[PDB]
Amino acid sequence: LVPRGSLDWFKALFWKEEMELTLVGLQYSGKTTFVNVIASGQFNEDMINMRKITKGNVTIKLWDIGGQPRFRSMWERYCRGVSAIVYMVDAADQEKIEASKNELHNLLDKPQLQGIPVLVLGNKRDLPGALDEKELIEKMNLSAIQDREICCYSISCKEKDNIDITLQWLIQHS
Ligand SMILES: Nc1nc2c(ncn2[C@@H]2O[C@H](COP(=O)(O)OP(=O)(O)O)[C@@H](O)[C@H]2O)c(=O)[nH]1
């Protein structure tokens, strides 16, 4: 009996969805850690920087943003058709926020990606002084993003905090 409403409950629901997503953000933001949590440490991975993660009916295109200039266009074009963009931010690394913001805004400035919902995740909320979702909406200038649905949650992969509401949001955007 999988406690209804538990994290395992949402994980099960999530993986059965036929869904493509991109998971992208600066290196060290917690993207690999996040996949490991939501996939319960079991998933398929194929290199394609870019990783194609598969589990259930779900495919995740995982990549670190701000990589080689020659591959940037290729990675952003590889995101065409996804149901959602999940943008991971290290909410406790104040000095990387400006780079994180600028890469997000440059990404959402790409044509093939028009209208795709974005979920910004302020990861590492467990660390003292980490930005909360209100502060991140502010520091990331999320209000400037007007041609799409954008949402922002404060989460902890380490303490498995708000991972459930993240899965629910993703399921809603199948
Ligand atoms: N304190 C804390 N550390 C985290 C959290 N999530 C990930 N990390 C750590 O951040 C470091 C980089 O994480 P990683 O998943 O490799 O980031 P990636 O480069 O975006 O894939 C690792 O040491 C993780 O354990 C979190 O929620 N809290």
UniProtKB/Swiss-Prot annotation:
<dbReference type="GO" id="GO:0035577">
    <property type="term" value="C:azurophil granule membrane"/>
</dbReference>
<feature type="binding site">
    <location>
        <begin position="123"/>
        <end position="126"/>
    </location>
    <ligand>
        <name>GTP</name>
    </ligand>
</feature>
<keyword id="KW-0458">Lysosome</keyword>
<keyword id="KW-0653">Protein transport</keyword>
<dbReference type="GO" id="GO:0008089">
    <property type="term" value="P:anterograde axonal transport"/>
</dbReference>
<dbReference type="GO" id="GO:0016020">
    <property type="term" value="C:membrane"/>
</dbReference>
<keyword id="KW-0966">Cell projection</keyword>
<dbReference type="GO" id="GO:1904115">
    <property type="term" value="C:axon cytoplasm"/>
</dbReference>
<dbReference type="GO" id="GO:0005737">
    <property type="term" value="C:cytoplasm"/>
</dbReference>
<feature type="binding site">
    <location>
        <begin position="64"/>
        <end position="68"/>
    </location>
    <ligand>
        <name>GTP</name>
    </ligand>
</feature>
<dbReference type="GO" id="GO:0005525">
    <property type="term" value="F:GTP binding"/>
</dbReference>
<keyword id="KW-0967">Endosome</keyword>
<dbReference type="GO" id="GO:0045202">
    <property type="term" value="C:synapse"/>
</dbReference>
<dbReference type="GO" id="GO:0007059">
    <property type="term" value="P:chromosome segregation"/>
</dbReference>
<keyword id="KW-0547">Nucleotide-binding</keyword>
<dbReference type="InterPro" id="IPR005225">
    <property type="entry name" value="Small_GTP-bd"/>
</dbReference>
<keyword id="KW-0813">Transport</keyword>
<dbReference type="GO" id="GO:0048487">
    <property type="term" value="F:beta-tubulin binding"/>
</dbReference>
<dbReference type="GO" id="GO:0030496">
    <property type="term" value="C:midbody"/>
</dbReference>
<comment type="subunit">
    <text>Interacts with PLEKHM1. When GTP-bound, interacts with RUFY3 and RUFY4, but not with RUFY1, nor RUFY2.</text>
</comment>
<keyword id="KW-0206">Cytoskeleton</keyword>
<keyword id="KW-0131">Cell cycle</keyword>
<keyword id="KW-0498">Mitosis</keyword>
<dbReference type="GO" id="GO:0005886">
    <property type="term" value="C:plasma membrane"/>
</dbReference>
<dbReference type="GO" id="GO:0070062">
    <property type="term" value="C:extracellular exosome"/>
</dbReference>
<dbReference type="GO" id="GO:0051301">
    <property type="term" value="P:cell division"/>
</dbReference>
<dbReference type="GO" id="GO:0101003">
    <property type="term" value="C:ficolin-1-rich granule membrane"/>
</dbReference>
<comment type="function">
    <text>Plays a role in lysosome motility. In neurons, mediates the anterograde axonal long-range transport of presynaptic lysosome-related vesicles required for presynaptic biogenesis and synaptic function. May play a role in chromosome segregation.</text>
</comment>
<dbReference type="GO" id="GO:0031902">
    <property type="term" value="C:late endosome membrane"/>
</dbReference>
<comment type="similarity">
    <text>Belongs to the small GTPase superfamily. Arf family.</text>
</comment>
<keyword id="KW-0342">GTP-binding</keyword>
<keyword id="KW-0472">Membrane</keyword>
<keyword id="KW-0132">Cell division</keyword>
<feature type="binding site">
    <location>
        <begin position="27"/>
        <end position="33"/>
    </location>
    <ligand>
        <name>GTP</name>
    </ligand>
</feature>
<keyword id="KW-0770">Synapse</keyword>
<dbReference type="InterPro" id="IPR006689">
    <property type="entry name" value="Small_GTPase_ARF/SAR"/>
</dbReference>
<dbReference type="GO" id="GO:0003924">
    <property type="term" value="F:GTPase activity"/>
</dbReference>
<dbReference type="InterPro" id="IPR044154">
    <property type="entry name" value="Arl8a/8b"/>
</dbReference>
<dbReference type="GO" id="GO:0005765">
    <property type="term" value="C:lysosomal membrane"/>
</dbReference>
<keyword id="KW-0159">Chromosome partition</keyword>
<dbReference type="GO" id="GO:0051233">
    <property type="term" value="C:spindle midzone"/>
</dbReference>
<protein>
    <recommendedName>
        <fullName>ADP-ribosylation factor-like protein 8A</fullName>
    </recommendedName>
</protein>
